[PDB]
Amino acid sequence: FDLEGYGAISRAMGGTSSSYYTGNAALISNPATLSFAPDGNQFELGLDVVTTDIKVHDSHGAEPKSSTYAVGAQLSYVAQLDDWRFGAGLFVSSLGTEYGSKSFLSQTENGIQTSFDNSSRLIVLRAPIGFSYQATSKLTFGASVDLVWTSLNLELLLPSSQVGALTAQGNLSGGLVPSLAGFVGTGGAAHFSLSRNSTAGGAVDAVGWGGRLGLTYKLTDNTVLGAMYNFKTSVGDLEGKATLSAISGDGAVLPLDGDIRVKNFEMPASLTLGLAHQFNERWVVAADIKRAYWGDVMDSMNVAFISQLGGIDVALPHRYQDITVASIGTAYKYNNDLTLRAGYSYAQQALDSELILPVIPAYLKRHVTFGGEYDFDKDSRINLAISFGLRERVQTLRQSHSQINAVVSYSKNF
């Protein structure tokens, strides 16, 4: 879901990654770039805090606001040995909405203000084991594999009409649907809740695996070429405790308690390629094109709620498409220890969608990165980064939202 950049310096140059040293976050990016590290053993610690700013406005002007900040982190050690760089890491990141329980999105049809809450929070934990061999002096090659652990927590309200659209498109089923239609009726609402790791398991979480591999060529003595393939993150089944709760035309509430199993939530596979010409030996420039490939694997994400009274089920086809994100970045060393970086990264999806789901914000296209490094030891470096998600006005409801992302790292060398 870090479709964009990964690393404090990769984040600082428009998410570029493939054909230059991006720190140890290249494990999550292109492990073939790790052999461009200084000698010995780089040990990195990164911190990222992300403030999001969604403003859904609706049919006849009512403001639902989400001004939440998610934070992710990073810590990794890549050790030299021969050409072989052998590192590993823990990469946590976070994303979420929290609109509260006073919005129009906390209304039934009719318009009855319920107490229910709209909110979401995902936490992925990539954790790669990776390598980087220098083959010839012109070619390096790396690969990693990550253990992954996702945790999803959700508070979602659907006005009756949306439920009806779901059964009508052949998407909803399950024996609770009859049963509880006619408690919810044409002015009611259904609600789902998935609450924090209070239960040891539960939580709604899964384990799985992801993969990576890459390369690099020095076409000039001052121009590098780079390619890497990220795999579809094969997330296991999300499982935990949920509460489906049915609300009626007057505001009555039927709380129900069962287990949800979310099948087939894929992160996408992706193929990026790029260069980094250095035409001045303190004025570097890099650029990649990434294409993220969803449009493959033609199955369906299945949300199954089972309970003592019966099951509800939602099948959402995997549909989907590419996102092509052209990104460029520069890195002028104006002096010995201080490189200064900037960039931009326009993404554009192929066949679009306008699934205005306020609890699922969509990736912003035009980001604008900035940042730089200060070596204050040459064996103890530090990097920072700031990225502006230039905002969209999407319109089905009508949304507006923007991201500011802000990173740092510390790399002490050994």
Numbering used by the authors: 4 to 399, 409 to 426
Mind quoting what the paper says about this structure?
PpF1 has three FadL orthologs, of which TodX (Pput_2883) and CymD (Pput_2901) are located in the adjacent tod and cym/cmt operons respectively. In the presence of TodX/CymD, robust growth is observed, providing the first direct evidence for MAH transport by FadL-type channels.
The lateral opening in TodX involves both β-strand S2 and S3, contrasting with EcFadL in which only strand S3 is involved. Strand S2 in TodX bulges outward, whereas S3 has a less pronounced kink in the same place as EcFadL. To flatten the S2 bulge, we removed seven residues that were not visible in the density of TodX, replaced a proline with alanine and inserted an alanine to connect the strands (ΔS2). To flatten the S3 kink in the ΔS2 mutant, we removed the conserved glycine residue G104 to give ΔS2S3. We determined the X-ray crystal structures of both TodX variants which showed that, as expected, the size of the lateral opening is drastically reduced as a result of the flattening of the strands, while the remainder of the mutant structures are very similar to those of wild type. The two TodX mutant channels ΔS2 and ΔS2S3 have much smaller lateral openings, while retaining overall high structural similarity to the wild-type protein.
